[model samples]
Target: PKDTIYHAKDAVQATKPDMRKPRLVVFVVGETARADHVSFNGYERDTFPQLAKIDGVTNFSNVTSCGTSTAYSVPCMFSYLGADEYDVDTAKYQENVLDTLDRLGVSILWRDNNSDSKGVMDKLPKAQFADYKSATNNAICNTNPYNECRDVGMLVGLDDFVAANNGKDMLIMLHQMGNHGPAYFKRYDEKFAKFTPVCEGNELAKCEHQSLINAYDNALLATDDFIAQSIQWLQTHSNAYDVSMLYVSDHGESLGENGVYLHGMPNAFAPKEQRSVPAFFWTDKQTGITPMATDTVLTHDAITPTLLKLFDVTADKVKDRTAFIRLEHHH
Candidate 1:
């Protein structure tokens, strides 16, 4: 065995929070979804109509991502380590927010519709993982030859996943293939193509620029549906669980801006399109949980901290973590 730098096993002890019932959180890590493109963040395009109409949902306007690519952002967002200290090659051997939740008996589930978890889920004890890239049974998939079942495909087995978990405090994570490009046209069904004359193929450079935007916006329609339906699913199970959902993209994408077509630009040189991500939080009204600092500029570093507080997992052994105040005293 090679030398081990750190061991997360029992590094943080787990204990129950001050809650009367169990909680279920659906955490979504979206792919290539830029905040500037989402209507909730003031994008002129009405791309997320369904998520917009939800009763108590809130969208953050000034959220920043950790990196410009999935390979870097995914791990960093889930890590307590900030981007300045995180190195991708060695990230595999470390523990992250997922492990913290797991150790606390949150009954974790990770479903991927994108490339992978980018090593974030590596240390999960009994990792309940699923891949839904080819969800042939769901109509959201194969709505066209170009589509690969898409993000909503991951929601298919959620009901059974809950039943199987057997009444434990749960954290269900869905990694979406949301609006991933340059074949953006493939991510959503034709009915979602409210933007006409969408770019057809992967070669985005040669396609009409407006058409590229059209396809990208069209795919967000699918994301809107996925999040809305997910909320409804959790609401149905609300009697037994205090349900909440968070949808955040790993990183934002740049669509034909300053000759940049996709994401992955270096941090020092990347523009707003490559840095800001769309993050939304929705909780059952009874929980009365509201995210802090919705209008202030925030970064991925806040994710694990907020989750730690929401889950009410204390870490007296480690002193570096930031805990969020998720509730207000009323009920």
Candidate 2:
């Protein structure tokens, strides 16, 4: 099939003159991270130490993913469905909201760090985060098997990528190699490590689950560092354009609680720890987007339309516009 391309002029108009979409917006999506395990969410461990310092990051306690696995959640999240009206079948339609944004002049970039989790990046321009490094023997090369291409590596790459595409509205998607189970110890560095009695050889069941929790906690800390670095880079280069970053996990994880070690188990049986995750949205106030805390809950569905609005796009093409304004200034 030939690629069907749409021109920007024929699509929609920017809602505001100064609003040139976010000069850059990055969505740091993680996998299998439990809310309770993150320090920002009150975990006793020092997980998410870097993210804690950023101002205007609202820790939305009531957020939830429509599905437990990336297979469903990823596509569903980028779809035009909201809670109570979610229809997975609607996602089968060839066109998604991101495509509409692209047609309207938003360049989208996607990078994945996980082991080909069902080609979630197929829809966007992407870079695979080097999964082969996982099978390598060099400690520095494969510092974290689970996160084969470390978060810092992504940070470095992101800076370069953003620099290369300066002055254009960009939607950057980062599928992080979070604590994705079994290889939890590889998730973070030894210093940030805590939790003892962990399994040495990927023995998830045998290792004290607390140790696994510690490793996962360290991963979150690494993620925090990755985020802080990215934001700082954006701030330093704000001369290029306005910037904002939002970080959310596709789903949460289980740490021996009720006998669940990883995620993607049957949704019905999955514990609340796996479904209810610690999710938050943060932005450099310099972007002109207001930064404030609120108690409203945001679902995965609102993602697409919100991006549209951020880019100054306003068109009826986005079906789930109701959820699009969680951070709307008027609201």
Candidate 3:
């Protein structure tokens, strides 16, 4: 709850370094997660039990996704355009800011639980890609195994990755296979059954809307648990290196609300549920670098430059940046 006032400001020349310690930048990108379904946001169910217990984790309440689906929003997120100027034609699938990280000698790894068919998948190195089943037709959720094909499965190999590559600047992209669904039973485990008279199946439009919401709420709990566990691992391994983690979603999802059950519809009529998202960052204070203001609004456009700045990379090289970071830092 730092006293913070952030209005949009354009990018200027890169500032000088303030390096007093080693920095670990972990970027967590969630897919199809909804905003109103978690305990951190005051849901009656204990959806985010683990995240609710974290000390420095910020539950940024006023956040929005740039687009309605991963196909449009993912590119918009990593690109220079601030969602306003997202140029689809100019987008390159394999080469991007991550390549810039590579040129700068950042040790980066992308571990995804979603399908590798997306354009962005080519940008990551082969060794970094984790084993995940393809479910593009089902909107990135496992229509077959449900919870076993979750985003947390990607983290199974993460500790070994860290152990293999230590003492180097690192960027780990954790793409969560979140509440993407046909709704209801598809998104949750039956153990968190809260809404009474719940639907027994994923007949989204036919099922009761609140029951679908209850299932999505359970998915949110799983997401929160994974995040908390990841942070705890980083803290325990702090002796290995300095660490910080940023968590945000590519876009939100729609459940049978306002007659929409999934995203990818044209944005003109997409519900607010599909546009709003949650953004948070966690950093242990012992590392000497602390988050500027946890409550300030942040957009995906600021991600690249903020990361560059945090890792002491000069901003002059990062072209076509946005004002997302202007409010917090004097740079």
Residue range 146-232, candidate 3, lDDT tens digits: 434555555555667766765666778777667667653554555545556565575777776766676677667667767887787
lDDT of 1 by residue, 1-331 (tens): 2333443444443434344667888988888888888887778989889887888787888888888998989888877566778788877766677777777677888888887788777666544876667555444666677557667767776888788976778888888888788778888877788998988977888999889888998888888888898888888888888888888888888887888879898998988898898888888878767666567566787677667655766543234543233434566
Q: How much lDDT does candidate 2 score?
A: 0.62
Better of 1 and 2 by TM-score: 1
For each candidate, the alpha-carbon lDDT, in order, equals 0.77, 0.62, 0.63
**Lowest summed lDDT window (length 10), candidate 2:** 130-139
| Candidate 3 off by > 4 Å | 1-21, 42-44, 93-95, 121-124, 134-147, 189-197, 292-295, 317-331
Rank order (by lDDT, best first): 1, 3, 2
Between candidates 1 and 3, the one scoring higher on TM-score is 1
In TM-score terms, candidate 2 sits at 0.81
Q: Candidate 1: lDDT of 149?
A: 68
What TM-score, computed on C-alpha atoms, does each candidate reach?
Answer: 0.90, 0.81, 0.80
Which residue runs of candidate 1 sit more than 4 Å off their true CA positions? 1-19, 125-127, 135-140, 316-328
Candidate 3 clashing pairs? Answer: none
Higher lDDT: candidate 2 or 3? 3
